[PDB]
Every structure is written in C-alpha cells, then in structure tokens.
Symmetry: C6
Subunit: 77 residues, 6 copies
Amino acid sequence: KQNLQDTFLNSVRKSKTPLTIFLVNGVKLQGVVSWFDNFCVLLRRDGQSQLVYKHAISTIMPAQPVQLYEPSADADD
Amino acid sequence: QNLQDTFLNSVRKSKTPLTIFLVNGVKLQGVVSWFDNFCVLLRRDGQSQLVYKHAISTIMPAQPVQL
Amino acid sequence: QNLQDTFLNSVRKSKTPLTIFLVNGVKLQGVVSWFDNFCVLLRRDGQSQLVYKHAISTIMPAQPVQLY
Amino acid sequence: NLQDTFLNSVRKSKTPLTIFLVNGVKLQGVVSWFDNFCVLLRRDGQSQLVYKHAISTIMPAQPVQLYEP
Amino acid sequence: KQNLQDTFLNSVRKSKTPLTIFLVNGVKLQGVVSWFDNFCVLLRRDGQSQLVYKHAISTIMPAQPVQLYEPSADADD
Amino acid sequence: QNLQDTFLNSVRKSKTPLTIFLVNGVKLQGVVSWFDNFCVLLRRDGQSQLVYKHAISTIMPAQ
C-alpha cells in the first residue's frame, strides 16, 4: 500500500515518536512530526512548529524503535 | 491545499515574523509577503528579496501558528 | 505572472542593479538581462554570465522594487 | 534497472553496507527497505530513514553479485 | 524560439568560445562546450573531453563577449 | 542519441578507466560497468560501488 517514506512519516506522526532530523548542512532538529506533504515536514517542538523542507533533510532518526512493517528479505516487493 | 501552502499562507496572512534558515547556514529574518511554487518574497526593514525554496532548509515562526 | 516571473521580469525591464547570493556564499553583482526555467543571464557592464538558479540562494535588489 | 537491482540485492541478502552522504558523514548498517526517494538503514535496533537525494555512494562490505544486460 | 540556456550553450558551442565553468564546490573548469543535453555539458580542453553535470554548475563565464540576442528591456518576453 | 547516454555507454563498452569527481570534493576512480537514469556502477579492483549521479560533479576519462 504505502511506500517507505509515507509509512515511516505516518508511523512516527501517529505515534508521536520523538525524532532527530539531520539536515544536510549538519544542523540537527528535534521534535515530533505533526504533518507532512510531498516536499516538507512540520516539526512540532514544545508549542512551536517549524516547516522543514524534505529536500534539506539527510536522515530522520527516531529516539525509540518504531513499527514500520518493513518487507521481509525472503521475498520480493 | 497541503501543508506548505497552509503554512506559508498562514504566516503571510498574519504578518508573522519568522526566521529563514538557509542550507548554507545563513539565517534570514523578516516577513513573507508573497510566495509561489519555487520561491518566497521576504520583507525586512522595507527591503524585500527573492529567496529560493531550494536554498531554504527551515522556516521557524517567532510566534506559533495553527491549522 | 507568478511571484518569480513578476520579480525577475521587473528587475529585468527596470535594469535594477542586483546582488545574487549563491548557495556557496559567493556574491554576484550585475543586472538580469534574460532568464528562463533554470538559468539567469547576469550581465555587468560588458560581461555575460549564465547563472543557474539552483545555485542561487537569494536575490537582493540594490533599490526597493515596486512589484504589483 | 541498476538502482533497483542493486538495492534489492543488498536488501534480500542483508549485506552490510557503508552509505557515504554528500556532506561526508559515513553511515553503517543494512538496507531493509527503499522507495523512490528514501532508504531504510537498520543498525542494531535502530532504524534510520535516509533520503536518496543526500546519498553520494553506497558500497557493500562484501562483494555483490548482479546480472547485467 | 530558443530559451536562454539553449541559446547560451549553442552559441558558445557554435563559436567555440573559451569558457570558465564555476562549480558550486568552488573549483573552476575551463574549456569549450562541444556538446550538451538537458543535464550535462561536455567540456573539451586540448584533446580531453569531460562530462560536466549541470547540477554541479553555479555560473558559466565566457572568456570573450558573446552574441546572444538577449530580449530588449523595453518589451515583454 | 543523447550526450550522457552516449558518453556513459562509450566508456562502459570500451571499459575506459575514468575519474569521478564528487560535489563534496572526493575523487573516485574505476570503470563504469552499468548505469541507469540516476546511478552508475563504478567498479575498481573487483569492488563495485553505486554512485548517485546527483552527487557527481564531473566525469573525466583517463584515455
């Protein structure tokens, strides 16, 4: 159904998992994903939410393991 | 409507002061006065410059908004 | 016209002296004489220079431009 | 294609990889999932979404076997 | 007819104008454009030809003034 | 056909050694054994490496 990005982003948003965003320029932002579309992610931190462009993000690391139902390495996609 | 349009229209309609963080580590301050698919018009101290969305990494409003 | 087209066509038709700030911090000065989907022709006096917009951070006019 | 064959191969084989990013930092782990824009790198109990647009190279620790046209 | 990029590249190719291609990472390439497509430019320097990707190009500087037939500032393009 | 396809197929068919310059300054050497729309497969000394075109600045062949 959903791809890898939508599954990952919807999962960490529905579970409100604390995250760490590693921007390509080395800046690190923390918070939770409250909303995302095709080009950006809305990061909520305390009461302040900031828009982060996907094109500026390198990695998104959850603070705790998150259930993504990743495909098994025994069969194809 | 999506998140980016809602966010940008909100911070525009509300004259919200914000901080544009660029991918090169440069910070910009001002108010978004106009935006399209690829850029935004940031006004500060009466001077408005064209900022390209691929140069923007984050947009942080000084006062939060909602939707 | 959209924001980008209105801004670029106005500083072009008006020959507004500009300062293009690149993503690598390099500053370019001149006047836009032509632009398309990806590039911008920056000419300062007798010299031409094709500037790719993906390398542009911000464009700041030397004088405030009335865009309407 | 090449990218899909390579990524599927190192995924199904769970090959230990080293992902070099454009900003120079090095990532170690196994690719468990990938789409058109991102790659899911698993190391220990950690899962890290990595965007393809920020990757420079992907090199496997052990040699990979691919069938080319 | 042609847009700015196609006019610029075809002109410096047809006239074999010596160029200085500035990359985003600060390094400067010199030579003559012998061929180009939507994403790449083949720069020739002596008898060496190297593929230059447009996504790494910041500016392109011709060594001499080049005729481009730019639009007049008095009318709309 | 297109320049990039012609250039890449040429150095692949002839197995010409080349130097891949990345946008972060790193230099890679090897032979292109396979490529698609977004990546190339650079092989050197039996080790194959998936290189993303969007990270490449220039490709200079040795010959």
